[PDB]
Structure 1
Amino acid sequence: GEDENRCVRLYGPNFILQVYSSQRKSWHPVCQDDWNENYGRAACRDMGYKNNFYSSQGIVDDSGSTSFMKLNTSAGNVDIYKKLYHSDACSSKAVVSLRCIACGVNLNESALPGAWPWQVSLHVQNVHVCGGSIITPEWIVTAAHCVEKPLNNPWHWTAFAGILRQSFMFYGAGYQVEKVISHPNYDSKTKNNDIALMKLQKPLTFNDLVKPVCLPNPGMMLQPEQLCWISGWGATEEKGKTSEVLNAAKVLLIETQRCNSRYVYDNLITPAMICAGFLQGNVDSCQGDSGGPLVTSKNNIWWLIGDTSWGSGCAKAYRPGVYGNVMVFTDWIYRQMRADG
């Protein structure tokens, strides 16, 4: 009962802790009574975050559902999720909110230092090949086509964080990647499920210039056309190369029913893919921004939407770019972090 009756999930933009109820086949929140920091740490560790704990507090219930996995005290030194049991309603009038890692905060054309602390550059043979996105001190998200077949040893890659100038990414100064994990479903032709995990050999030290980017929690309600941003080293000019500077471009999401139209991609886009162009063109991703982060701001937190997959003109819009859906893979990401622990 470890692939069901022991699964916890944070929910919503407010980080509402939940526990699965096999008896009723549902996700339920947890009442705040009897709860302390220790059970918050246990719920974080179970979720693959290991020792990362940020804050837990009670928040007035807003989802509206009337049911709770109430905790026990006299059960003994047993599994934490051996205790959580159902109840009609607690008297504390508060549900638990649990943040396992501080993320999604940045300092307030080219991008200034500390504006995208979660951006990294990946160096195969001293040359910028793919970007990335920090999610924890020792895990970076990128694409599967970056690390496929010929290039798949962790000994080929190296990461640079907090440095803005490609000229300033010296040899022997990056972070060595100690493992490369590609999604098993990844299909080299359709590039479906194009996401890879690249575990660094040493943890990243977080400061004003280096910081994580939060993962998409379930139930985010992305509006039809958000206002995202795209970052990475590329070339705004076509027929270009890896830009000397890190840039950033406002991009607008595109509905999958429009991006799969026959003027755009005629069903090329699968459920695990996301489009984000910009009307009037003049802005999109580009080479060297493949494997880079697409992020948005909702409820005061920078969220990770996806990572770059492919395009057909790259600032020649009416053929916009495509990114993988981080939300869909988040459970596999959690599993991979959990097993490695």
Structure 2
Amino acid sequence: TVGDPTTDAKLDFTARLTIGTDYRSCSGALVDTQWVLTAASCFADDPNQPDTVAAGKPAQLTRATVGRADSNIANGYVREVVELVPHPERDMVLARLDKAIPDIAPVRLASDAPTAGTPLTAVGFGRTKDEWVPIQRHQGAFTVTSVTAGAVNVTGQGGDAICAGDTGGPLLQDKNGTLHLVGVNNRSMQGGCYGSETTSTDAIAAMSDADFVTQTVNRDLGTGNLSDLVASADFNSDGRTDVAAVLEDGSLHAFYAKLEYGREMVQIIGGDFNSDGNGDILNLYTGTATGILNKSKPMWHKTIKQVTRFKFNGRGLVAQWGDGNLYGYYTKVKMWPDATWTRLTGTADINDLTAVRDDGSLNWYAARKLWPDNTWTPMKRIIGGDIAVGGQSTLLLYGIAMRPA
């Protein structure tokens, strides 16, 4: 990367990493305060065959400095790498740091590929035309020549080739001040470099992968100590009922059914109450096309024990009152002739309202026995036709572990 030096706070999300004392060195960039994205080849015995770069601890002590645009000053943060998470298909790895850097923001990821003719920029700590190792990081300019299967081909504009030490460095495309990561540099012709010569300025970079990062960075949102506030609804317009749950951070997170993790109160109930096509969550939080809930509003103008979802005439709630009676609400109807209600659960298309008795027996109302054994005593907040938080607070589907471990 041969161009002007830059120390401005536009590209301070970049990083430089070294492996061992003098074994290997390459570039990278932040995707989170705890995570840095680089190439997998940096950790390979043979960088041209990054197949043996397994997940786990680095083979050699690996360290990275973040935001240190100028190597002659102490500005920036220094962190150690503890774990690596390689991409299953291409030359890309996520590095987990021992400690976070909350002061430096990550770079946003691109939603799609750049096309041929698109003006891209790149920044890194690699070699220059006249220096083996630079003092400051430099920014160059490249154009897209073509797009291939999971990668983007670029060329230098007016020279400025990708050289050496640029591996793992970001490819960026900005719009209206917003920077998105479009790919990661892997290989290059290295023309116009100190100590070598070739005419070509061509280079290839791995295509940015938002899902790879999302399911790694947020890999551990759940599986730990979660609240009992769980509900089901279609939150991604997929036709598959998803699951939302509240974590220790007090926020509601959506996990999508295929459970994969998304990006973004005594009892919680969902469902498409207004038939808007976007699942909702006594105040109603309406769903939107982006999967984000809007500001809630009262559903009405305190002696109820349990409330669960129930579909009435295609659209609803059922409330179990402290007097043992169960009523449905749209206008209300009696769900059962007498006060015979028992743990109330949500509904499911078994052939239907599920329920759990104090003796551990599971049944459903059109009651009829739903489970051969009587082991549902400790089960709470059972949600919906497939259908409990479990004794370990891990949601099971009937009991398959829908959540990762």
Q: For 2:42, what is the secondary structure of its paired residue?
A: helix
Partner of 1:287: 164
Residue segments in structure 2 that go unaligned for 5+ positions in a row? 47-52, 193-197, 222-405
**1:311 correspondence with 2:192:** no
* 2:213 aligns with one of 328, 333, 336: 333
Partner of 1:121: 16
1:98-139 deviations in Å (ceiling 9; x for gaps): xxxxxxxxxxx1102423111100022355711111111111
The amino acid across from 2:123 in the alignment is: S
Partner of 1:213: 107
**1:253–1:277 contact (8 Å) kept in structure 2:** yes
1:144 deviates by 0.9
**Larger Rg computed on CA atoms:** 2
Partner of 2:255: none
What is the distance in 1 between the residues matched to 2:73 and 2:18?
13
What is the distance in 2 between the residues matched to 1:125 and 1:141?
19
Query: What does 1:182-197 align with in structure 2 at a 5 Å threshold?
Result: 182-185=86-89, 193-197=90-94
Partner of 1:138: 34
**1:273–1:323 contact (8 Å) kept in structure 2:** yes
* 2:150 aligns with one of 250, 272, 289: 272
What is the distance in 2 between the residues matched to 1:279 and 1:164?
23
Q: For 2:13, what is the secondary structure of its paired residue?
A: coil
Query: What does 1:1-341 align with in structure 2 at a 5 Å threshold?
Result: 109-126=4-21, 129-149=25-45, 153-154=57-58, 156-168=61-73, 174-185=78-89, 193-206=90-103, 210-217=104-111, 220=112, 222-237=114-129, 241-256=132-147, 270-281=148-159, 283-315=160-192, 316=198, 318-326=200-208, 329-341=209-221
Q: Which has the higher strand share?
A: 2
What is the distance in 1 between the residues matched to 2:120 and 2:157?
13
Q: For 2:109, what is the secondary structure of its paired residue?
A: coil
Q: For 1:123, what is the secondary structure of its paired residue?
A: strand
1:319 deviates by 4.5
Residue segments in structure 1 that go unaligned for 5+ positions in a row? 1-108, 186-192, 257-269
**1:147–1:182 contact (8 Å) kept in structure 2:** no
**1:273–1:324 contact (8 Å) kept in structure 2:** yes
What is the distance in 2 between the residues matched to 1:314 and 1:214?
30
The amino acid across from 2:218 in the alignment is: R
Provide closer, same or farther for how the CA distance between residues 115 and 301 of structure 1 changes in structure 2, counting only shifts above 3 A.
closer
Partner of 1:78: none
Q: For 1:334, what is the secondary structure of its paired residue?
A: helix
**2:63–2:81 contact (8 Å) kept in structure 1:** yes
Partner of 2:398: none
1:279 deviates by 3.5
What is the distance in 1 between the residues matched to 2:123 and 2:137?
7
What is the distance in 1 between the residues matched to 2:126 and 2:45?
24
TM-score if structure 1 supplies the norm length? 0.54
Provide closer, same or farther for how the CA distance between residues 221 and 184 of structure 1 changes in structure 2, counting only shifts above 3 A.
closer
**1:278–1:317 contact (8 Å) kept in structure 2:** no
**2:12–2:69 contact (8 Å) kept in structure 1:** no
**1:215–1:303 contact (8 Å) kept in structure 2:** yes
1:141 deviates by 0.7
The amino acid across from 2:220 in the alignment is: D
**How many residue pairs align between the two structures?**
202
**1:242–1:287 contact (8 Å) kept in structure 2:** no
**1:279–1:317 contact (8 Å) kept in structure 2:** no
1:16-67 deviations in Å (ceiling 9; x for gaps): xxxxxxxxxxxxxxxxxxxxxxxxxxxxxxxxxxxxxxxxxxxxxxxxxxxx
Identical pairs, percent: 19
What is the distance in 1 between the residues matched to 2:74 and 2:62?
13
What is the distance in 2 between the residues matched to 1:126 and 1:243?
18
**1:295–1:303 contact (8 Å) kept in structure 2:** yes
1:71-96 deviations in Å (ceiling 9; x for gaps): xxxxxxxxxxxxxxxxxxxxxxxxxx
What is the distance in 2 between the residues matched to 1:293 and 1:307?
5
1:284 deviates by 1.9
1:148 deviates by 2.4
**1:225–1:253 contact (8 Å) kept in structure 2:** yes
The amino acid across from 1:318 in the alignment is: S
Superposed CA RMSD in Å reads 2.6
What is the distance in 2 between the residues matched to 1:221 and 1:332?
15
Provide closer, same or farther for how the CA distance between residues 308 and 134 of structure 1 changes in structure 2, counting only shifts above 3 A.
same
**2:116–2:143 contact (8 Å) kept in structure 1:** no
**2:162–2:201 contact (8 Å) kept in structure 1:** no
What is the distance in 2 between the residues matched to 1:306 and 1:224?
14
Provide closer, same or farther for how the CA distance between residues 169 and 145 of structure 1 changes in structure 2, counting only shifts above 3 A.
farther
